[PDB]
């Protein structure tokens, strides 16, 4: 239980429909190379687009991404405590959160409902997670590697994915095509046919 | 080979702010503001994690105060506007007289404020539509999703309308069952 989070602190000073907009952005990142093994934590900060000050778990202290973020860098690294927290990031923040979701995000798996249809064949894979998947066309036990193409991986924001893999070909009277799907939700190579 | 991002932002003058966890591009949960409660982008995560509530707000108010400062560091340099890039597509393949969902893709935009309309033929009707909050991209631009449960009539033509300050005038990206 108990999902945890991170936090930020002030800068130097204080503060106070066509109106000109302003935007602040804070991304606490994380990066996991194969599980709880080597882990890279990132604490970023932005202004509009531009990244100004940063913290790399591998640099052990706040650096600067522009002279525009120069001060905040020196300012935070001047605070003993905080640096001892962010230094522990990977273990308090990353490993932890990851530990909670090692179930319903990392290991979460769902079947790839697969269809097919001319519009040139089409092969529509749907509602599958993760999106790491192989789809290869087959003409009569041979693999057709050319003249193919992919819509690539698509994202629905609901955790399902989707992809359209087209195959441009001219058939004749009694051959058989095939569309083959392997996603690590499947013990077997799910397939579909056309004639 | 994996990412856990907790991205947050404060926006002035609109004074609106967001708090969310992007895991591998799809959202986990975002703490709502008015409601001031945990809201998952998917409920199946409902009883596992259980995130703090006002906890978000603490950050947010911070990010505000950071913005106040970081503004006077630039000599009050405003935001460079960005247009969205819109495409509308069907969840599964569209069949005849089969249930389905339109998904409106607004992408690569900023600041994170948009007005979306689901209308047919020009009929502004919304029956149990759905909208996900802003998802952060690599370029720190923004992503978003409006859904639209619906049925495939060879008659109707459904349309998506997105208003943003990046486009000098409202955008209409259409779709029709073919």
């Amino acid at each position, epitope marked *: 239980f108990s999902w945890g989070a991170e936090g*930020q602190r002030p800068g130097f000073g*204080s503060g106070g429909d066509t109106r000109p907009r302003f935007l602040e952005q804070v991304k606490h990142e994380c990066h996991f190379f194969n599980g709880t093994e080597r882990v890279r934590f990132l604490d970023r900060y932005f202004y509009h687009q531009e990244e100004y000050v940063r913290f790399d778990s591998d640099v052990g202290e706040y650096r600067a991404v522009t002279e525009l973020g120069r001060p905040d860098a020196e300012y935070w690294n001047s605070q003993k405590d905080l640096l001892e927290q962010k230094r522990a990031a990977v273990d*308090t923040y990353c490993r932890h959160n990851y530990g909670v979701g090692e179930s319903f995000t990392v290991q979460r798996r769902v079947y790839p409902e697969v269809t097919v249809y001319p519009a040139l064949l089409v092969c529509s894979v749907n509602g599958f997670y993760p999106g790491s998947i192989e789809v290869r066309w087959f003409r009569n036990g041979q693999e057709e590697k050319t003249g193919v193409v992919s819509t690539g991986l698509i994202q629905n924001g609901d955790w399902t994915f989707q992809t359209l893999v087209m195959l441009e070909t001219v058939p004749r009277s009694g051959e058989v095509y095939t569309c083959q799907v392997e996603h690590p939700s499947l013990t077997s190579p799910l397939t579909v046919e056309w004639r | 080979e994996h990412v856990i991002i907790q991205a947050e932002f404060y926006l002035n003058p609109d004074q609106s702010g967001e708090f969310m966890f992007d895991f591998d591009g799809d959202e986990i949960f975002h703490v709502d503001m008015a409601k*001031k409660e945990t809201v998952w982008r998917l409920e199946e995560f409902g009883r596992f994690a259980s995130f703090e509530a006002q906890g978000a707000l603490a950050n947010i108010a911070v990010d505000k105060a950071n913005l106040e400062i970081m503004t006077k560091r630039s000599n009050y340099t405003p935001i460079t506007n960005v247009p969205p890039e819109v495409t509308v597509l069907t969840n599964s393949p569209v069949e005849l007289r089969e249930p389905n969902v339109l998904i409106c893709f607004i992408d690569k935009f900023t600041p994170p404020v948009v007005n979306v309309t689901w209308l047919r033929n020009g009929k502004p009707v919304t029956t149990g539509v759905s909208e996900t909050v802003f998802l952060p991209r690599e370029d720190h631009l923004f992503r978003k999703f409006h859904y639209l449960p619906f049925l495939p009539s060879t008659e109707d033509v459904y349309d998506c309308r997105v208003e943003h300050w990046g486009l000098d005038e409202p955008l209409l990206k259409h779709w029709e069952f073919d």
Partner: T-cell receptor, first 115, second 109 residues
Framework: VVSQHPSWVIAKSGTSVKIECRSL??????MFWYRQFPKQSLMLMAT?????????EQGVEKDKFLINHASLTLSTLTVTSAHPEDSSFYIC????????????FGNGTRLTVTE | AKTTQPNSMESNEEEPVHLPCNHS???????IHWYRQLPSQGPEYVIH???SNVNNRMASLAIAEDRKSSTLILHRATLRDAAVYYC???????????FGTGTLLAVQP
């Protein structure tokens, strides 16, 4: 460091009691208002995130206590409709940010309100 | 209800005093803070740590292997240590500092 003014005070059976809290140096993103009754414990009344709706922990008298938290510094906990049963030890704290930001306290304001 | 402590406890001057704290079970990322209060005045910081062990001036800190229990250590107890010692939890899952029931220590001259 943070100062609580006034440190002592007394008013009528009801009145406006305006208790400030000021962070003399750092910017205060968050404010915690604790009140402590005689030989009891430290109870958490409210939370003021800068320029926001102040969240009152459950079991409070609601609009009875009002937090004006203003910019980064001036923070006004004002209690109107004074009551004898409310005389207590009122302690305020400031924070240099969100989670795991050291919680910086203050003097605290001891108050008796008679009729 | 965050963490539990014994209401009151007695010691002797110059004597080492060990202060028990049991918290239930606490989440993965939360620090354990120990705050104390002079008889009438604001509270004040003492010491904290994730796991393992930690010590500084004014005191030391004993965290159990499973992080189920913690113990505040006072090497040589002076008269000014008489006070209430609160044991709380502050961290990633708790933004708010939730003040416990308390341990009152009276040290005898």
């Amino acid at each position: 460091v943070v100062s609580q003014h006034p440190s002592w005070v007394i008013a009528k059976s009801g009145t406006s009691v305006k208790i400030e809290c000021r962070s003399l140096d750092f910017q205060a993103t968050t404010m915690f208002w604790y009140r402590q009754f005689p030989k009891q414990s430290l109870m958490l009344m409210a939370t003021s995130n800068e320029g926001s709706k102040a969240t009152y922990e459950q079991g409070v008298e609601k609009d009875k206590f009002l937090i004006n938290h203003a910019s980064l510094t001036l923070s006004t906990l004002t209690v109107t409709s004074a009551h004898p049963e409310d005389s207590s030890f009122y302690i305020c704290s400031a924070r240099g940010g969100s989670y795991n930001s050291p919680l910086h306290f203050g003097n605290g304001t001891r108050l008796t309100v008679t009729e | 209800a965050k963490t539990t402590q014994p209401n009151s406890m007695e010691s002797n001057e110059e004597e080492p005093v060990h202060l028990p704290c049991n918290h239930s079970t606490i989440s993965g990322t939360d620090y354990i803070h120990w705050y104390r209060q002079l008889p009438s005045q604001g509270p004040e910081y003492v010491i904290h740590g994730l796991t393992s062990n930690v010590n500084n001036r004014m005191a030391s800190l004993a965290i159990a292997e499973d992080r189920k229990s913690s113990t505040l250590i006072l090497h040589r107890a002076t008269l000014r240590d008489a006070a209430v010692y609160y044991c709380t939890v502050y961290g990633g899952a708790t933004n708010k500092l939730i003040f416990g029931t308390g341990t009152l220590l009276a040290v005898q001259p």
